[PDB]
């Protein structure tokens, strides 16, 4: 299958886009999943250096797989401001040559929505899908705890409620496993909507809270329990056997220390495992 | 006075240390306040490129003013792990040639400590001071809401309770103003302990919550109300008149968008204002 690197793995170190691309290339990645804030800042302040890089990506068998961001469609949100952000993301996706935008479906668990709140959010996701459909771009909701996609049945339900051809899924197997669902079974049920994967692992359920966004974004955040794919509790042998003959990128979503060492080691094992 | 740039201003963009140093130099900064995670990652993965930069800093009238980090000395903390982090920070400070480490005094407001919790934290700050004193390095507590330094009297009290020669203050005037204290008066009272400043401003008290750490660290975090120094509610004319003939660096602590544009514009006004 095709592996991608996420620039979010480098959120706590000083490194240039040029050096990320070179690292991706020399380690056999075929894609880069570009964090939205990185995309935006390259466009504003590194436009020429970035354009030169983009013009050789293809020569290195690299591409931008997706831009991964956060669209606020909560009731408290200034929705016109969210729409303006979508329009800027479509500009960035055009420049980076990607047709996918990752977002999250809400900021609390499905069980905590009233049927009325869940209705208003379905309508807003639909609106965002119709905006991106003009640009022939897909909106991928990531499967995540504390969102509407925090369980397999809620995710399936959401997809049926929005009922739009440009709404797709970024399947994050760790979070799917966390919800109590079987990873292969979730893949099989979500297959018609999947366009991308996230692969990460944890040593034990005891440490799942290290993936809470606030902990992930904090420089001094806890990394205990974050482990390479074949060294954690989720069974990546079974997952990769299922997904390896789909066409979608799987990002190695590493949030721990020493990203380059971990990523480099991961790719050697991924290419050679049985 | 002497101005420094904080690498934390660049936490949401891909940029190299070499480009930060060059930007600092061409805009008349005389110092760089290096975020601890940036320092650590340069040491692990960019040691040669960083060493070459460090060897010309002096030629550019630049230096590393401080490494700014987070030491967990709460009761829930693994304190031996905190001590190990201090030992690594002393290694980094040696390499970067700085004698200052910024930390925060606790993770909740002074009013929320029992006299017993506050005692245990005083003892731990004292221990950290004694560790860094071996390396002839100073521990600077930053004045911050939701910490023991959230008011001027609590900060003064803390300094008297620890009573160690290596405990110093990083005076963040915005947060001091937020606490209800007068900035110039706080400078005058805290003067014997001050070794560094942070300068940032806000358009109105209504927007002070945008400085909450979780909001600051999040890529999609709100930046509304963050404004250049002379365009906000805190009076930087009065502050700079007081502090301009001290020897301490003042960092332009910008957490908003377009850091390079904002910082470049700031330095032109700072050099030329009356
Ligand atoms: Cl540019
Ligand atoms: Cl190195
Ligand atoms: Mn993910
Ligand atoms: Mn500050």
Curated annotation (Swiss-Prot), chains A, B:
Effect of residue 217 to A: Binds substrate with 10-fold lower affinity
GO MF entry, a single one: 3-dehydroshikimate dehydratase activity
Keyword list, A-Z: Lyase, Manganese, Metal-binding
EC number: 4.2.1.118
Outcome of swapping residue 200 to R: Less than 5% activity remaining
Reaction(s) this enzyme catalyzes, per UniProt: 3-dehydroshikimate = 3,4-dihydroxybenzoate + H2O
InterPro entries on file: IolE/XylAMocC-like, Xyl_isomerase-like_sf, Xyl_isomerase-like_TIM-brl
Top-level EC class: lyase
Cofactor annotation remark: Binds 1 Mn(2+) ion per subunit.
Active site: 144
Cofactor annotation: Mn(2+)
Family matches, as Pfam families: AP_endonuc_2
Residue positions binding Mn(2+): 142, 172, 198, 253
Pathway linked to the protein: Aromatic compound metabolism; 3,4-dihydroxybenzoate biosynthesis; 3,4-dihydroxybenzoate from 3-dehydroquinate: step 2/2; Siderophore biosynthesis; petrobactin biosynthesis
pH dependence per the entry: Optimum pH is >9.5.
Entry binding sites for substrate: 70, 102, 142, 172, 175, 217, 253
Phenotype upon loss of function: The deletion mutant cannot produce petrobactin on iron-depleted medium. In vitro analysis show that mutants grow to a very limited extent as vegetative cells in iron-depleted medium but are not able to outgrow from spores under the same culture conditions.
Coiled-coil intervals, chain numbering: none
Effect of residue 70 to A: Binds substrate with 10-fold lower affinity
GO biological process, one term: 3,4-dihydroxybenzoate biosynthetic process
Quaternary assembly: Homodimer.
Function of the molecule: Involved in the biosynthesis of petrobactin, a catecholate siderophore that functions in both iron acquisition and virulence. Catalyzes the conversion of 3-dehydroshikimate to 3,4-dihydroxybenzoate (3,4-DHBA).
Name this protein carries in UniProt: 3-dehydroshikimate dehydratase
Organism of derivation: Bacillus anthracis
């Amino acid at each position: 299958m095709k592996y991608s690197l996420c620039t979010i793995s480098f959120r706590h170190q000083l490194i240039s886009f040029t050096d990320i691309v070179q690292f991706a290339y020399e380690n056999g990645f075929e894609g880069i999943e570009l964090w939205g804030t990185h995309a935006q800042n390259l466009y504003m302040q590194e436009y020429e250096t970035t354009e030169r890089e983009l013009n050789c990506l293809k020569d290195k068998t690299l591409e931008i797989t997706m831009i991964s961001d956060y669209l606020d469609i909560s009731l408290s949100a200034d929705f016109e401001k969210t729409i303006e952000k979508c329009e800027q993301l479509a500009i960035l996706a055009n420049w980076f040559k990607t047709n996918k935008i990752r977002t999250f479906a809400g900021q609390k668990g499905s069980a905590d929505f009233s049927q009325q709140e869940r209705q208003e959010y379905v309508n807003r996701i639909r609106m965002i899908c119709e905006l991106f459909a003009q640009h022939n771009m897909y909106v991928l909701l990531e499967t995540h705890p504390n969102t509407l996609t925090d369980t397999l049945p809620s995710t399936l339900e959401l997809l049926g409620e929005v009922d739009h051809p440009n709404l797709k899924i970024n399947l994050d197997f760790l979070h799917i496993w966390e919800s109590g669902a079987d990873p292969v079974d979730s893949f099989q049920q979500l297959r018609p909507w999947i366009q991308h994967y996230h692969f990460k692992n944890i040593s034990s359920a005891d440490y799942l809270h290290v993936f809470e966004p606030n902990n992930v974004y904090a420089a001094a955040g806890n990394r205990t329990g974050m482990v390479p794919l074949f060294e954690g509790i989720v069974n990546y042998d079974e997952i990769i056997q299922e997904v390896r003959d789909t066409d979608h990128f799987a990002s190695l979503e590493w949030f721990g220390h020493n990203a380059k060492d971990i990523l480099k080691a991961e790719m050697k094992v991924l290419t050679n495992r049985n």
